[PDB]
């Protein structure tokens, strides 16, 4: 008279299938990308242009000597 099945206490667990979490898609991407990339080239032309100014100063000390 000592046998298994309980009178109660059950679930069940699902048979389902779901993890579609979105996700920042669909014109949200391709907009943060271009907005990041244009910040890069804007951070250029303030350094590459400025290094071009110090470049001429480096040639300047050459030319003021050599006679």
């Amino acid at each position: 008279k000592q046998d298994m099945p309980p009178v109660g206490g059950y679930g069940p667990i699902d048979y389902k299938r779901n993890l579609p979490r979105r996700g920042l898609s669909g014109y949200s991407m391709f907009a943060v990308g271009i907005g990041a990339l244009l910040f890069g080239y804007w951070s250029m032309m303030k350094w590459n242009r400025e290094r071009r100014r110090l470049q001429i100063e480096d040639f300047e000390a050459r030319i003021a000597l050599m006679p």
């Binding site: 242009r49 071009r52 100014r53 470049q55 001429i56 040639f59 030319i63 050599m66």
Partner: protein, 80 residues
């Protein structure tokens, strides 16, 4: 033809991204006035040495003192 730019971008968006960067690259140097400053910066960077000239009649400009108001306008870069 207006569906062809949307019914090949559902099949192969690989070369479409190439032509989009191939285009809008040849077009822009004919557009912005930032170019020809790219040739203006690149002209007044002295590599060699400035040899002087001689007075003979003229005397056009630019006497023996360099810091006089004598030469052309390349001093807009320090203000830039």
């Amino acid at each position: 033809v207006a569906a062809f730019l949307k019914n090949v971008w559902a099949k192969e968006p690989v070369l479409v991204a190439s032509f989009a960067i191939a285009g809008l690259a040849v077009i822009l140097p004919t557009l912005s006035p930032y170019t020809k400053y790219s040739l203006m910066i690149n002209r007044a960077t002295p590599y060699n040495y400035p040899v002087p000239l001689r007075d003979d009649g003229n005397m056009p400009d630019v006497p023996s003192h360099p810091q006089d108001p004598q030469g052309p306008s390349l001093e807009w870069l320090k203000r830039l």
